Amino acid sequence: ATFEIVNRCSYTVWAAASKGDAALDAGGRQLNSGESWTINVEPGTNGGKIWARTDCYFDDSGSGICKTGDCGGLLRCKRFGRPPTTLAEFSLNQYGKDYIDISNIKGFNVPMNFSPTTRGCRGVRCAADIVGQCPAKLKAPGGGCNDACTVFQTSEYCCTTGKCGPTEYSRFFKRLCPDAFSYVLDKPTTVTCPGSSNYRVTFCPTA
Secondary structure (H helix, E strand, O other): OEEEEEEOOOOOEEEEEEOOOOEEEEEEEEEOOOOEEEEEOOOOOOOEEEEOOEEEEEOOOOEEEEEEOOOOOEOOOOOOOOOOOOEEEEEEEEOOEEEEEEEOOOOEOOOEEEEEOOOOOOOEEEOOOHHHHOOOOOEOOOOOEOOHHHHHOOHHHHOOOOOOOOOHHHHHHHHHOOOEEOOOOOOOOOEEEEOOOOEEEEEOOOO
16 A cells, blocks of 8 residues: 655655554654655554654654654664654554544644545544643643653553543544544544545645
């Protein structure tokens, strides 16, 4: 499947793509304002994610640090990034269907639009100013708005036992972005698309 990733933000983002135990494609790349990066992802990839990183500093060897979404100090991510991170998540060709969602379960850093570029399903978006409105206890000094698991590490916020309810923090994310997952057991806002669809991940879709 082909994903085009578009930075429409007025600042540089360092895009990342991983399935947790492997890079997707190059795994990561600088995207200045307006730049686009097309990547291939294998059919059948299950549990892929795409996100943005902010305020990175990297050397000529591809090693360094980002203030959000850092994946162990690498440019070319092999693993998932450190919260907070708005998440494009995808499992493709699963019994003939592709599954897409935006998650706020690991917090929010950059607004995002995650849409097909082929026929037969709809896209989803989280574009509200979550960072401006973030509750003071969730605000990440590096930038972004952490989720409450990250901040407090309780069974209720991390849905440890598999029973958890919505919380004052989850409802904050949900009020601003209804179409994104706000906690582990939220009513699904997964979209079902035809198997082997293509897509567009855009950072700052309304800016």
